[PDB]
Design a protein around this ligand. Structure first.
Ligand SMILES: *[C@@H]1O[C@H](CO)[C@@H](O[C@@H]2O[C@H](CO)[C@@H](O)[C@H](O)[C@H]2NC(C)=O)[C@H](O)[C@H]1NC(C)=O
Ligand SMILES: *[C@@H]1O[C@H](CO)[C@@H](O[C@@H]2O[C@H](CO)[C@@H](O)[C@H](O)[C@H]2NC(C)=O)[C@H](O)[C@H]1NC(C)=O
Ligand SMILES: CN(C[C@@H](N)c1ccccc1)S(=O)(=O)c1cc(F)cc(F)c1
Ligand SMILES: *[C@@H]1O[C@H](CO)[C@@H](O)[C@H](O)[C@H]1NC(C)=O
Ligand SMILES: [K+]
Ligand SMILES: [K+]
Length: 497
């Protein structure tokens, strides 16, 4: 419906420029008739989710690359895709004019955008905050009579979440994660630094902390918001580290095991919020499978844990098979979920690289890797940042798919936005990953899924410089003759009878 307005900032590709009177958008979503496929294409050279259509053919000849769909080889069901409504994201979005705010939220949450259905909500402050606070800073309030939501929630985050829900046609799921407890519950009496809950699981400190989760859910429920899931702590490994610079709360895996078994599990299960899912870990993948082993081999903890949340710092290398793969092999009934991902966090790299195709490819390659290792969903970090990658009270700046420039009442949609959208827009909740078998060695990254209504979706990423002809075979339906251009990403969709 409206094309990308491209702008270059001297990186490898372009951003798309939106403002108070213009943003790129799609027509309302429709499928091609049976016998036709849809292709959405983005390229380093500047194409941004451009739609074209082609015939599904009865016949195929040639010794070229064939990707054969395995519709009956079924893997995980997909929860969805989204990002985080941090204080920084909320401040950046609301710093735009009301029209530009609307176009930004439509970009992420509407069917005229990329159809996000997950929002992660910090429980009080984190690094992507300008004020340090918890919901219960009054000391020694063990019954949490003075628990309350400040304006960061009631004036910024909650109204924006309500606006996102109004724009979405897909049901949206909220995920909550805490960084720190009130400091009077902590061994070090500070929001940051090395420190854990005082005492031991099953005591007043741990029971008060578990009750804070219920107070949080109660408070959001008064604002007519309900949660799909909570995590047991954002990055529990970080609070074990001397000098940790921002909000944290340290748990060893044994500590998290016992806290879930004795306090958090029982407290959530006894509340009106018993249907909220509990995700463990919420941390980097090299903690697996060890953390999963420690927690899930205790039946009293295991009975409360619905899933394992993992963080992806895309700037850094770590094994996928030995972490995610091995965890799925040992614990196939406990879903894996990616709860946070980001790029640009290395001090020596520019936090925000406007128009970086490389960072876009990092996003889509990560998502493909996650989906091929059984992960049910993928959640970006901050929904929007400023050109510095902030605000952030400890200057821990990073990149974001949307960058706001308040001085021009403008926002920029990064390659990362389109790379995420190649998945989020075209993979409804309840889709199932299926197999896809390559006929020969090749340089492409790809994943196939089946929609709840039986339709097919295939994403093909080409991180190489070479255009690669290929054929996609759907054994029931026929052949898609296509090309994967160098430095491109494509999403293919078709009906199946
Ligand atoms: C928002 O951005 C749009 C798109 O760049 C601006 O509209 C363009 O304005 C230039 C200069 O007049 C024209 O050459 C283009 O034809 C316009 N494009 C479109 C699609 O209208 C627009 O002026 C900006 N809005 C604000 C409020 O700054
Ligand atoms: C389990 O859930 C119920 C909520 O229905 C809790 O009962 C409340 O307990 C507090 C204790 O101060 C009372 O003031 C409330 O009046 C009770 N609510 C109702 C509706 O009667 C119960 O304490 C919970 N048990 C826990 C958390 O261990
Ligand atoms: C095995 N494939 C990737 C291979 N063709 C490839 C691509 C680029 C250079 C060298 C080899 S794959 O199945 O598409 C895949 C598996 C995976 F575990 C994570 C991926 F990102 C993608
Ligand atoms: C497809 O292959 C069959 C078998 O040789 C042939 O009869 C048919 O005409 C071919 N062409 C088309 C367009 O289906
Ligand atoms: K308070
Ligand atoms: K940086």
């Amino acid at each position: 419906a409206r094309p990308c307005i491209p702008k270059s900032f001297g990186y490898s590709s372009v951003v798309c420029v939106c403002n108070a009177t213009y943003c790129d958008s799609f027509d309302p979503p429709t499928f091609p008739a049976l016998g036709t496929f849809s292709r959405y294409e983005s390229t380093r050279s500047g194409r941004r989710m451009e739609l074209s259509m082609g015939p599904i053919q009865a016949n195929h000849t040639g010794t070229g690359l064939l990707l054969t769909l395995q519709p009956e080889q079924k893997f995980q069901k997909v929860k969805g895709f989204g990002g985080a409504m941090t204080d920084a994201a909320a401040l950046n979005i609301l710093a735009l004019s009301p029209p530009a705010q609307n176009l930004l939220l439509k970009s992420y949450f509407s069917e005229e955008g990329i159809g996000y259905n997950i929002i992660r909500v910090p429980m009080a402050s984190c690094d992507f905050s300008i004020r340090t606070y918890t919901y219960a800073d009054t000391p020694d309030d063990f019954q949490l009579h003075n628990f309350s939501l400040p304006e960061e929630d009631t004036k910024l985050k909650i109204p924006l979440i309500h606006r996102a829900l109004q724009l979405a046609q897909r049901p949206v799921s909220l995920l909550a994660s805490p960084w720190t407890s009130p400091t009077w519950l902590k061994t070090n009496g500070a929001v940051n630094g090395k420190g854990s809950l005082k005492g031991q699981p099953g005591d007043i400190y741990h029971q008060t902390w578990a009750r804070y989760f219920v107070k949080f859910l109660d408070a959001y429920a008064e604002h007519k918001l309900q949660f799909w899931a909570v995590t047991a702590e954002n990055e529990p490994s970080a609070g074990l580290l001397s000098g940790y610079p921002f909000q944290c709360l340290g748990f060893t895996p044994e500590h998290q095991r016992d806290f879930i078994a004795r306090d958090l599990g029982p407290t959530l299960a006894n509340s009106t919020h018993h249907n909220v899912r509990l995700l463990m870990l919420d941390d980097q993948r090299l903690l697996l499978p060890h953390w999963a082993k420690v927690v899930l081999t205790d039946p009293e903890a295991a009975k409360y844990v619905h899933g394992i949340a993992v963080h992806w710092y895309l700037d850094f290398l770590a094994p996928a098979k030995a972490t995610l793969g091995e965890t799925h092999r040992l614990f196939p009934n406990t879903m894996l979920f990616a709860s946070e991902a980001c790029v640009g966090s290395k001090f020596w790299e520019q936090s925000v690289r406007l128009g970086s195709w490389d960072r876009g490819m990092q996003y889509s390659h990560s998502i493909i890797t996650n989906l091929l290792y059984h992960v049910v969903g993928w959640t970006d970090w901050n929904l929007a940042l400023n050109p510095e990658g902030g605000p952030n009270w400890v200057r821990n700046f990073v990149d974001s798919p949307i960058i706001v420039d308040i001085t021009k009442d403008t926002f920029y949609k990064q390659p990362m936005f389109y790379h995420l959208g190649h998945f989020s827009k075209f993979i409804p909740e309840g889709s199932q990953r299926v197999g896809l078998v390559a006929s020969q060695k090749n340089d492409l990254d790809a994943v196939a899924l089946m929609h709840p209504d039986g339709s097919a979706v295939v994403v093909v990423l080409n991180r190489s410089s070479k255009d690669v002809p290929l054929t996609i075979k759907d054994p029931a339906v026929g052949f898609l003759e296509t090309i994967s251009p160098g430095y491109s990403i494509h999403t293919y969709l078709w009906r199946r009878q």
